[PDB]
From a paper:
The structure of AC2aCel5A was solved to 1.8 Å, and contained two molecules in the asymmetric unit. The final model comprised residues 9–397; no electron density was observed for the nine N-terminal residues nor for the final eight C-terminal residues, including the His6-tag. The native structure was solved to 1.8 Å resolution and revealed a narrow substrate-cleft, likely determining the specificity of the enzyme for linear and less substituted substrates. A surface projection shows the narrow groove stretching across the enzyme, with the active-site located in its center. A comparison of the active-site clefts of the GH5s shows that AC2aCel5A has a narrower active site cleft than its homologues, especially in the vicinity of the −3 to −1 sub-sites. This is primarily caused by the loop region between β3 and α3’ (red surface), which protrudes into the substrate-binding cleft and which is extended in AC2aCel5A, compared to the examined homologues (residues 115–126). Nonetheless, AC2aCel5A is unique in that it has an exceptionally narrow active site cleft, due to an extended loop region that seems well adapted to (only) acting on less-substituted β-glucans. AC2aCel5A contains a tryptophan “clamp” in its putative +1 and +2 subsites, analogous to what has been observed in other glycoside hydrolases acting on insoluble polysaccharides. Furthermore, in both the apo- and the complex structure, extra electron density was also observed close to, and between Trp178 and Trp254 in the substrate-binding cleft of both chain A and B.
Residue numbers in the entry: 9 to 397
The structure:
């Protein structure tokens, strides 16, 4: 069976992981700074905390903007690359699989504290082939440098080519009516990144590389992503993100989820989420192509009864992922609030739990990891909590 191959095994080995979010990706006025959005800098204790909790992987999103020299060499500032290098190796010391990327360089929405500085510009590339050529040259120079730094680091280190590429309308815009022009350029960008990584030598030759589809949307991925042509077989993984359904998990307009919820996104619950996973399973996993959620999550709630629904969500979706051989990394931005943007469960400098974060972390990891054939999606379903409305 292709789903039993070495690649899918590797994907599964990431298990449930954790994002060091709003950290090396944080930026304003055109430059990234680790502490720029209010997290303290990560330490060895951070990564020790993750491994102790049972996370198998860690994603370290990195925004490069502000640390990139002028064309044509686009030289990366050594101090910045040093810190990325250091974090990667702290994570490795803790026994974690590690993903690094190009992150808010390609932020494509209007609401950015770095207006005008996002060089990785999809609409600009679609409007002009000469702009597309320039962006591709920068991508090549950047990934070449990154790969050259990490040429002696093996397959525990994963490169993810890009983050969430879009035109600002989050997949509901012109991408659905431009004759696939945006999807095509994104596909070209992923090819260029893979080419660069493979050209960087040494262990970049057989490194796993994660590639995403449009705005990391699973369906637009399944429907339009073209896996780049590679110099070796079975070393690409499909990266996706899910905060579905958004008005439960992300905006928290609704604070219950699933078949026992009353304050729910209308008609969007377990079946919908499983359907999305099924599409990924059939398109990729079933064919021996691994899939991982680079980001998933749902915000924290103020009420205990509401919080039980969040834990239910994690148990259910993470079980569904395991059953489909899909790994997933929880989005942690360090924010301890309830509601919108409230994703912090582990302190980014100390590795300790934030508030009641242990209960969330346990829900996700222990559901994915469970190896009892009597622990099933049905058993989680039947144990769903009681509405408080």
């Amino acid at each position: 069976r292709p789903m039993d191959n070495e690649a899918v095994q590797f994907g599964m080995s990431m298990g449930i992981g954790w994002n060091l979010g709003n950290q090396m990706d944080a930026h304003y006025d055109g430059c990234s700074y680790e502490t720029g959005w209010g997290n303290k800098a990560a330490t060895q204790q951070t990564f020790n905390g993750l491994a102790k909790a049972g996370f198998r992987s860690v994603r370290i999103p990195v925004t490069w903007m502000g640390h990139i020299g002028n064309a044509p060499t686009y030289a990366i500032e050594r101090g910045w690359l040093d810190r990325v290098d250091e974090l990667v190796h702290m994570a490795h010391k803790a026994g974690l699989i590690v993903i690094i990327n190009i992150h808010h360089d390609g932020f494509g929405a209007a609401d950015t504290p770095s207006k005008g500085s996002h060089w990785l510009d999809l609409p600009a590339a679609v409007a002009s082939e000469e702009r597309n050529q320039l962006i591709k040259q920068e991508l090549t120079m950047i990934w070449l440098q990154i790969g050259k730094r990490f040429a002696n680091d093996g397959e525990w280190l994963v490169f993810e080519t890009l983050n969430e590429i879009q035109d600002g309308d989050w997949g509901n815009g012109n991408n659905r009516r431009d004759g696939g022009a945006q999807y095509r350029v994104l596909n070209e960008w992923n090819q260029v990144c893979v080419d660069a990584i493979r050209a960087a030598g040494g262990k970049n030759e057989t490194r796993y590389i994660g590639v995403p589809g449009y705005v990391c949307n699973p369906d637009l991925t399944v429907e339009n992503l073209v896996l780049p042509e590679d110099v070796v077989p079975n070393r690409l993984m499909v990266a996706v993100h899910s905060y579905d359904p958004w008005d439960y998990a992300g905006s928290a307009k609704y604070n219950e989820w699933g078949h026992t919820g009353k304050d729910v996104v209308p008609g969007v619950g377990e079946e919908a989420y499983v359907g999305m996973l099924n599409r990924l399973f059939n398109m990729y996993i079933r064919r021996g192509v691994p899939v991982y959620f680079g980001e998933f999550g749902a915000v924290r709630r103020a009420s205990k009864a509401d919080e039980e629904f969040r834990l239910y969500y994690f148990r259910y979706i993470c079980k569904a992922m395991r059953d489909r051989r899909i790994s997933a990394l929880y989005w942690d931005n360090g924010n301890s609030k309830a509601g919108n943007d409230g994703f912090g469960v582990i302190d980014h400098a100390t590795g300790r739990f934030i508030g009641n974060g242990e209960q969330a972390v346990r829900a996700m990891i222990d559901s994915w990891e469970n190896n009892d054939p009597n622990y099933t999606l049905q058993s989680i379903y039947d144990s769903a909590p009681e509405s408080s409305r």
